[PDB]
Design an enzyme around this catalytic site. Structure first.
Site, PDB file in Angstrom:
ATOM      1  CG  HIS A  42      -0.396   0.617   2.425  1.00 58.51           C
ATOM      2  ND1 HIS A  42       0.328  -0.130   3.326  1.00 58.51           N
ATOM      3  CD2 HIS A  42      -0.417   1.880   2.912  1.00 58.51           C
ATOM      4  CE1 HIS A  42       0.727   0.649   4.318  1.00 58.51           C
ATOM      5  NE2 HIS A  42       0.289   1.874   4.091  1.00 58.51           N
ATOM      6  CG  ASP A  88       0.013  -3.492   3.299  1.00 58.42           C
ATOM      7  OD1 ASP A  88       0.210  -3.074   2.140  1.00 58.42           O
ATOM      8  OD2 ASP A  88      -0.023  -2.739   4.292  1.00 58.42           O
ATOM      9  N   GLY A 186       5.326   0.061   5.745  1.00 57.11           N
ATOM     10  CA  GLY A 186       6.465  -0.535   5.060  1.00 57.11           C
ATOM     11  C   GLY A 186       7.627  -0.777   6.004  1.00 57.11           C
TER      12      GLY A 186
END
Ligand SMILES: CCOC(=O)[C@H]1CN(S(=O)(=O)c2ccc3cc(Cl)ccc3c2)CCN1CC1CCN(c2ccncc2)CC1
Ligand SMILES: [Ca+2]
Lengths: 235, 51
Positions: A42, A88, A186
């Site tokens: 994302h 993700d 992340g």
């Protein structure tokens, strides 16, 4: 990073930040190898074209170990859906190999079995980033680390307000105001075992930052090894 | 055996091969002689803090 301490010299050498064309750091990442970077799928959205800076601890005072790199190929997990934040995860192939030196090094990927049985069964793990430091506050300028304890899956599922797929996992605090935040996605979630760190999760999401009753959801890396593996062969 | 007692006394990974236990390390290290420890091969092994 709400609460938490401060990443000191070579204490979070696997930490990596993704910068935009305005040079602003918008997300995190984890240095798996001299060529590959682990990040959240994302995160490949809050930027049209970005780069990845590494070896940076302060985003103001110029040090020396910093270094910028360029994504040669992004590898987004097909199965990702912004609608649920499922799967993700993505893996960035750099054009120039990363040169390991102080404040710059790769983090270890564990075996799926061993990992789930010994690394996520531990009491806590580490999350780090340049992210917001008070939900409403601004993007941090110093890279910091927060020791976050694991959350009982069940408790996890109950405390949430969304479907916690097999691909994600819980870590943090109920009442304590400590937990990742804006621009921290992340980022790396690492677990220590005998002074060596292993990649046990990606910074994915949460309902706010440090919100009581709520926790912080992390992309269960352990459930993506084989992918990330034949990923570092490009696929 | 028992990769459950104390990780089988291994440094990193652990596997209960049939009756006994067998250790291993991540790419970058090498299994010591005792077959329990992990030894780097580069100045910058994965998972180690650069101090
Ligand atoms: C009021 C402000 O909140 C929102 O609107 C923001 C806040 N931000 S953050 O920068 O503050 C952020 C980012 C990563 C994090 C990672 C961890 Cl481990 C913990 C906390 C985090 C907090 C994320 C997106 N939401 C908004 C929502 C949108 C809907 N969500 C789902 C989840 C699963 N299935 C379907 C939908 C959860 C998230
Ligand atoms: Ca700097």
């Amino acid at each position: 990073i709400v609460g938490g301490q401060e990443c000191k010299d070579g204490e979070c050498p696997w930490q990596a930040l993704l910068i935009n064309e305005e040079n602003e750091g918008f997300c995190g990442g984890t240095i798996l190898s001299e060529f590959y970077i682990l990040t959240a799928a994302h995160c490949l959205y809050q930027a049209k074209r970005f780069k990845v800076r590494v070896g940076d601890r302060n985003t103001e005072q110029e040090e020396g170990g910093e270094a910028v790199h360029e994504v040669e190929v992004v590898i987004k997990h097909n199965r990702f859906t912004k609608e649920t934040y499922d799967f993700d995860i993505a893996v960035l192939r750099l054009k120039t190999p990363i040169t390991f030196r102080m404040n710059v090094a790769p983090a270890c990927l564990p075996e799926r079995d061993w990992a789930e049985s010994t690394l996520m069964t531990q009491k806590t793990g580490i999350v780090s980033g340049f992210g917001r430091t008070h939900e409403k506050g601004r993007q941090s300028t110093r890279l910091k680390m927060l020791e976050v304890p694991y959350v009982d899956r069940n408790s996890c599922k109950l405390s949430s307000s969304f479907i916690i797929t097999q691909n994600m996992f819980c870590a943090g605090y109920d009442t304590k105001q400590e937990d990742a935040c804006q621009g921290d996605s992340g980022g790396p979630h690492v677990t220590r075992f005998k002074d060596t760190y292993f990649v046990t999760g990606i910074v994915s999401w949460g309902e706010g930052c440090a919100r009581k009753g709520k926790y912080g959801i992390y992309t269960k890396v352990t459930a993506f090894l084989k992918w990330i593996d034949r990923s570092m062969k490009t696929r | 055996k028992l990769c459950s007692l104390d990780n089988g006394d291994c440094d990193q990974f652990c596997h209960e091969e049939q009756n006994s236990v067998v250790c291993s390390c991540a790419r970058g290290y090498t299994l010591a002689d005792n077959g329990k420890a992990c030894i780097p091969t580069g100045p910058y092994p994965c998972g180690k803090q650069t101090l």
